Design a protein around this ligand. Structure first.
Ligand SMILES: CC1=CC(=O)CC(C)(C)[C@@]1(O)/C=C/C(C)=C\C(=O)O
Length: 174
């Protein structure tokens, strides 16, 4: 996946936001997407907590309060497209750092099986031409009698598809 030069450059961010030391019954993974677009452009979409459906394929709609303010602790209600093993997710914004380009959220409830899910998404400048690397990591409980391996495959597949869609949206923005 990540090159040596990408790792090195990305080392302290990964230690700071994307490394976990967990007990059993919980699992994590880290995923990376390269985007051939300025990190200002990528971050302008990543940080828009009220409109995840701009890049998240499986989200049919997202509702926020009439008094919504973009501030740690604000919440959103997302509704999943039809036919899926989940219908809704209730999510809380945990991080919004406009200097470092760090965001994250937690799933506090809803109709789905990704209990105590929390993810962190970070945006990184690379200079070849300016490009961007996005890291996204999550921790989640392993539902009793499911395996850690199926849980990770599920989360990873959704995050990977979302970060691909992010890359296509943000590259089209040039
Ligand atoms: C597509 C989908 C299906 C589910 O079964 C769970 C949930 C409804 C939470 C989800 O929206 C999960 C989305 C997660 C993994 C990544 C995200 O959105 O950053």
């Amino acid at each position: 996946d990540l090159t040596q030069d990408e790792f090195t450059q990305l080392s302290q961010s990964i230690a700071e936001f994307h490394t976990y030391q967990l007990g059993n019954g919980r699992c994590s993974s880290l995923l990376a997407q390269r985007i051939h677009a300025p990190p200002e452009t990528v971050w302008s979409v990543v940080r828009r907590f009220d409109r995840p459906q701009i890049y998240k394929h499986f989200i049919k709609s997202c509702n926020v309060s009439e008094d919504f303010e973009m501030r740690v602790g604000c919440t959103r209600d997302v509704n999943v497209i039809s036919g899926l093993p989940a219908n809704t997710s209730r999510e809380r914004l945990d991080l919004l750092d406009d200097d470092r380009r760090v965001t994250g959220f937690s799933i506090t409830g809803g109709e789905h099986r990704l209990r105590n899910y929390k993810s962190v998404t970070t945006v990184h400048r690379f200079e070849k031409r300016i490009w961007t690397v996005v890291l996204e990591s999550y921790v989640v409980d392993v539902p009793e009698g499911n395996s850690e391996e199926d849980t990770r495959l599920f989360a990873d597949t959704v995050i990977r598809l979302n970060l691909q869609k992010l890359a296509s949206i943000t590259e089209a923005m040039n």
